[PDB]
Design a protein around this ligand. Structure first.
Ligand code: NAG
Ligand code: NAG
Lengths: 190, 196, 114
């Protein structure tokens, strides 16, 4: 009956949201902890939808732990689960994106995050390309050689967590603003 | 010295791997010599190589891929020379294939693409590719380009016009596997347009 | 009993990323990763190897023994080489899921905890 979603926004905030039409027009409570030997604390930051509780926000303070939680119809637990929080990591969108051109090459840099094992990916294309081409690195300094100064290229960047460290169920960041470039100068459309 | 070299291929045939060794001196007497691998194996101490023409070959799922093994050249029971090697550091990838080049009329470039079986493997799934091209007439004026993808683009204005060009590609392991360059893919030939 | 304090963690980490990780995923093939409840935690790399040791080799209830699995044989081999003085209802998938989290946490020693 209870459908649940978890997001760990940029290693700052955990958001757990739930849906259950049975317990609609009713405020279910959310209780959590970060260890299996401590008492549960109650949610101090509730999200609502259609006037009733639909989620919880926890400030996790960059901590890498197993979140243990339960949703209750008062005292009666309706849903119980436990998960490593970083499995639902969504890194923040690339900030301060800069491009430096040299003849038929470009180096795209941006502000690196405070946590490691991430992939900073740059996607690009010209009007002659049918799909986006991609290059990625461990830091936000990706160099793409062999392009054409004479062509217009659309570009955008994002941050992904590495599957070997964070597992397969993470979310890529949102892509940064799209930028268009011909002959080492910025443009409007492409 | 009775020195030799080796290379491994992980998941070459299904989930089984291969270990291939050959002597550095080609003119040696092989009638009396046999190779033996000992250590970092699954539920066995040693395994024997098959003497096939001028090479020694193994093919099995019993490679542990943790720690070093001991590859020894044997003349009966006595070991003439011994080499301690980790099979994850002598990996030789399977060579790329379906290499092809297409001229794009409007773009004025050549889209080079190729394929590799390593994309469908579990272990050695990350490689660095080396695309080499030249004018078929020249000698050692080869131009090398390293890339992680299977698609590359050459500009028409950065190549000689009305010229036959040759292009081939090879791969080496990357990301927690070390080793050697694969064999080159078959070459692909293309003529560039004239100055018109 | 045993301190995994003087281990060559970087060599162990390389072994995990090469093939152990992949062997754990092949064992878990056919399961939905988001469906598992994670219950065993670890802090630093010595503590993670302590918990990995127990879950891979100590026979629990629900799972008789994972010792004959390829991932376990490689784990035993990595610890013998790189840890000095190291002595050596089918809820196995649930338990291997717990191992996967500890191995992964062993690769994130810079992240803080409560
Ligand atoms: C749920 O909480 C909201 C916000 O305080 C309130 O408007 C609503 O009356 C509550 N619902 C119930 C079931 O009492
Ligand atoms: C990008 O990295 C390369 C080498 O690591 C270096 O030459 C270049 O200065 C770097 N760029 C920035 C802005 O850090």
């Amino acid at each position: 009956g209870v459908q649940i979603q978890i997001i760990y926004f940029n290693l700052e905030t955990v958001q757990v949201t739930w849906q259950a039409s049975k317990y609609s027009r009713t405020n279910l409570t959310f209780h959590y902890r970060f260890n299996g030997d401590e008492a549960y604390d109650q949610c101090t930051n509730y999200l609502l939808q259609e006037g009733h509780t639909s989620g919880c926000l926890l400030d996790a303070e960059q901590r890498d732990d197993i979140l243990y939680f339960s949703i209750r119809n008062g005292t009666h637990p309706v849903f119980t689960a436990s998960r490593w929080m970083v499995y639902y990591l969504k890194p923040s969108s690339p900030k301060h994106v800069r491009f430096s051109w040299h003849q038929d090459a470009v180096t795209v840099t941006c502000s690196d995050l405070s946590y490691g094992d991430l992939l900073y990916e740059v996607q690009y294309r010209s009007p002659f390309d049918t799909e986006w081409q991609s290059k990625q690195e461990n830091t936000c300094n990706v160099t793409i050689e062999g392009l054409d100064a004479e062509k217009c290229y659309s570009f955008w960047v994002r941050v992904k967590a590495m599957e070997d460290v964070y597992g397969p169920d993470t979310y890529p960041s949102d892509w940064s603003e799209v930028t268009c470039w011909q002959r080492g100068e910025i443009r409007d459309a492409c | 010295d009775y020195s030799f070299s080796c290379y491994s291929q992980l998941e070459v045939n299904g989930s089984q791997h291969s270990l291939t060794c050959a002597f550095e001196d080609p003119d040696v007497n092989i009638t009396n010599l046999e190779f033996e691998i000992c250590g970092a194996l699954v539920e066995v101490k040693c395994l024997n190589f098959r003497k096939l023409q001028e090479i020694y070959f193994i093919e099995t799922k019993k490679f542990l891929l943790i720690g070093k093994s001991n590859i020894c050249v044997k003349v009966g029971e006595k070991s003439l020379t011994c080499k301690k090697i980790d099979l994850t550091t002598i990996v030789k990838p399977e060579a790329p294939f379906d290499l092809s080049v297409v001229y794009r009329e409007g773009a004025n470039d050549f889209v080079v693409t190729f394929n590799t079986s390593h994309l469908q493997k579990k272990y050695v799934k990350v490689l660095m590719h080396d695309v080499a091209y030249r004018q078929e007439k020249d000698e050692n004026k080869w131009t090398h380009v390293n890339l992680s993808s299977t698609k590359l683009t050459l500009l028409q204005r950065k190549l000689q016009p009305a010229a036959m060009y040759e292009i081939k590609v090879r791969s080496i392991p990357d990301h927690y596997f070390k080793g050697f360059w694969s064999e080159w893919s078959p070459s692909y030939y293309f003529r560039t347009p004239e100055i018109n | 009993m045993y301190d995994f304090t003087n281990c060559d963690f970087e060599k162990i980490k390389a072994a995990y990323l090469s093939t152990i990780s992949k062997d754990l995923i092949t064992y878990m093939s056919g399961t939905k990763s988001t469906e598992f409840n994670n219950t065993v935690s670890c802090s630093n790399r010595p503590h993670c190897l302590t918990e990995i040791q127990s879950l891979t080799f100590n026979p629990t209830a629900g799972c008789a023994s994972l010792a004959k699995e390829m991932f376990a044989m490689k784990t035993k081999a990595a610890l013998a080489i790189w840890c000095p003085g190291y002595s050596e209802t089918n809820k196995c998938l649930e338990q291997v899921s717990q191992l996967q989290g500890l191995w992964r946490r062993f690769n994130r020693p810079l992240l803080k905890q409560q």
